[PDB]
Amino acid sequence: AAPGAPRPSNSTLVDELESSFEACFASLVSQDYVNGTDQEEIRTGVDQCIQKFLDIARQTECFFLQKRLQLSVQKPDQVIKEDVSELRSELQRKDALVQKHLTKLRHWQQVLEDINVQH
Amino acid sequence: RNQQLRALQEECDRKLITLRDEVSIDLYELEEEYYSSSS
Amino acid sequence: KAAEKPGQEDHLYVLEHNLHLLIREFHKQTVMPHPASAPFGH
Amino acid sequence: ASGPFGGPQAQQAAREVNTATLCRIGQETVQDIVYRTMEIFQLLRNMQLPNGVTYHTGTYQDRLTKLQDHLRQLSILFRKLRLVYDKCNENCGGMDPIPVEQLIPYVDEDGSKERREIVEVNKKLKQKNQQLKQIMDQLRNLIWDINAMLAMRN
């Protein structure tokens, strides 16, 4: 109910996403005849469903960020190892790009070593 | 002969531009790479 | 029949422009006039 | 348990440790899910009439099929959405309540009242950036190579 203080509901934040995503396609996905006359009516519904979808999305985002903050202030070693692995991957990618550029320059100089025809 | 050596430089010039092109790509290929370093 | 000769990057790919500028100024004030028939101008 | 059930991860291992990586992968997954929703909407936007003037049944017949793949894609993302969601609720180790309200004073400066590997990796990355910039400088300066010489370049 609207004026009631207690919130009698549960089991959300997981099934809610799939529910919202599937449900507001109903205008499209439906095994029912479609009356070939409608305008400026189906709009408000899809606006509302994108609204609720981004809302629950933001909710999930905030929940994930709060969990990450709690685990970081709880287990900093995990975040340290994560940052270490990320830095290792970044260094590996940088080295790979450097090697690619080196091979490219090598090929480029090798092909036109004798660019001059004759003298 | 002049015309001949014209080609000798002309394509060469193009080659240089091609080099630049490749270099430019390489240039760009490193610029984003410069972003990654969080020093 | 020391360590001052080498300096900052001020090498071949500057002076070539200065050199080419001379022959370019020659060329620019050397093309046939051909304005309409033969007033012989610029 | 929570493992590699077909998630487009780069280097993450998704093991009993590094719950930070798990939370970050889940956040990335939901972000990519929203992005895929927007993308598939953009694709279905210009769903031109199948009965094309020139093309009879050639082009679109392929495109729609490709769209199906996209659908499949977002499909498995939903699966991943569950796989992480359990793990997020699984690793309940250490200070389960964790009041953020109390944590806000803690992240403040004051109230008027282990890192060896980290430092090693930091120094390694700093030296890597140094040698990277050293390698940069040369091609960076020689990059133009035609700018001063456009007077005769073509």
Q: For every residue of D11-46, which 3-state class applies, written as one string?
A: CCCCCCCCHHHHHHHHHHHHHHHHHHHHHHHHHHHC
Closest CA to A50 of A25, A15, A14, A13: A25
Is the CB of D121 inside 8 Å of chain B's CB atoms?
no
Cα(B2)–Cα(B10) distance, integer angstroms: 12
For residue B37, the SS3 value is coil
- Resolution of the structure in the document, Å: 4.8
Longest dimension (CA), chain C: 63
3-state helix, strand and coil shares in percent for chain A, rounded to the nearest 5: 65, 0, 35
Contacting residues for B33 by C-beta, under 8 A, at least 6 apart: A93, A94, A97, D132
What does the alpha-carbon distance between residue C20 and residue D148 come to, in Å, rounded to a whole number?
Answer: 11
Question: Which of B6, B8, B17 has the most A C-beta neighbours within 10 Å, making it the best mutation to test the interface with A?
Answer: B8
Letter for the amino acid at A40? E
Angle at which helix A76-111 crosses helix D116-141, to 10 degrees, equals: 20
Q: Is D4 left (phi over 0), alpha (psi -120 to 50) or beta?
A: beta
Residue A26, number of CB atoms within 10 A of its CB: 12
| Alpha-carbon D99 to chain mean position | 29
Contacts (Cβ under 8 Å, ≥6 apart) of A72:
A78, A79, D20
Set of chain B residues whose Cβ sits within 8 Å of the Cβ of A90: 36-37
Residues 87-146, chain D, touching A (beta carbon < 8 A): 88, 91, 93-95, 98, 100, 103, 106, 114-115, 117-118, 121-122, 124-125, 128, 132, 135
Element (H, E) at D141: helix D116-141
For D130-148, letters b (16+ CB in 10 Å) and e give eebeeebeeeeeebebbee
Spell D21-54 as b/e; 16+ CB within 10 A means b: bbbbbbbbbbebbbeebeeeeeeeeeeeeeeeee
- Give the SS3 label for residue B17: helix
Q: In Å, how far is D153's CA from the nearest CA of chain B?
A: 7
Exposed, middle or buried: residue C1 (CB in 10 Å: 0-12, 13-18, 19+)? exposed
Cα three-residue angle A70-A71-A76, rounded to 5 degrees: 120
> Quick check: D29 and D79 in contact, CB under 8 A?
no
Residue D129 CA to residue D135 CA, distance in Å, equals: 10
Q: How far apart are CA A29 and CA A21, in angstroms?
A: 12
Rounded Cα distance between D153 and A64, Å, is 57
Say if residues D30 and A60 touch (Cβ distance below 8 Å): yes
- 3-state class (DSSP) for residue A42: helix
Neighbours of D63 (CB within 10 A): 12
Crossing angle for the helix pair A42-74 and A76-111, nearest 10 degrees?
110
On whether the CB atoms of residues D6 and D80 are closer than 8 A, the answer is: yes
The DSSP secondary structure of A50-103, one letter per residue, reads HHHHHHHHHHHHHHHHHHHHHHHHH-HHHHHHHHHHHHHHHHHHHHHHHHHHHH
Contact D133, B39 (CB under 8 A): no
D151 vs C: CB within 8 A: yes
Set of chain D residues whose Cβ sits within 8 Å of the Cβ of C9: 141
Best of D118, D124, D128, D129 to disrupt the B interface (most B CBs within 10 Å) is D129
Enumerate residues 6+ apart whose C-beta is below 8 A from D90.
Answer: D1, D2
Q: Which residues contact A53 (CB under 8 A, 6 or more apart)?
A: A20, A21, A24, D37
Half-sphere exposure of D112 (CA within 13 A, CB side): 0
The rounded distance, in Å, linking the Cα atoms of D13 and A78 is 13
Q: Verify whether the Cβ–Cβ distance B16 to D145 is below 8 Å.
A: yes
DSSP C36: S
D146 with B17: CB under 8 angstroms? yes
Q: Which residue type sits at C11? A: H
> Is any Cβ of chain A less than 8 angstroms from the Cβ of D18?
yes
Q: Determine the distance in angstroms separating the CA of A68 from the nearest CA of chain B, rounded to an integer.
A: 21
In whole angstroms, what is the distance from residue D126 CA to residue D119 CA? 10
Q: Do A97 and B22 touch (CB under 8 A)?
A: no
The DSSP symbol for D152 reads T
Q: Touch between chain A and chain C (3+ CB pairs, < 8 Å)?
A: no
- Identify how the structure was determined: cryo-EM
Q: Coil, strand or helix: which one is D62? A: helix
Give the dihedral sign, CA A63/A69/A72/A73: negative
Distances (CA, A) of A50 to A46, C3, D60, D92: 6, 71, 28, 33
Q: Which distant-in-sequence residues (6+ apart) come within 8 Å of A100 by Cβ?
A: B29
Q: How far is CA D144 from CA A113, B4, B28, in A?
A: 21, 28, 13
The encoded tokens of residue A85 equal 């692995």
Distance from CA of D128 to the nearest CA of C (A): 26
Q: CB distance C13–D152 less than 8 Å?
A: no
Rounded distance between C-alpha atoms, residue B21 and residue D143, angstroms = 10
Nearest to D78 among A18, A73, A77 (CB): A18
Count CB-CB contacts under 10 A for residue A33.
6
Cα separation, D23 vs A62, in Å, equals: 11
For residue D67, give the 3-state DSSP assignment.
helix
Which residue among B16, B26, B39 sits closest to D139, beta carbon to beta carbon?
B26
Q: Is there a contact between B2 and A88 (Cβ–Cβ < 8 Å)?
A: no
CB-CB neighbours of A70 under 10 Å: 20
Q: Which of A28, D127, A99 lies closest to B37, judged by CA? A: D127
Q: What is the CA radius of gyration of chain A?
A: 29
A and B make contact (3+ CB pairs below 8 Å): yes
Q: What are phi and psi of A116, to 5 degrees?
A: -65, 130
Q: Give burial (CB, 10 Å; 0-12/13-18/19+) of A101.
A: buried
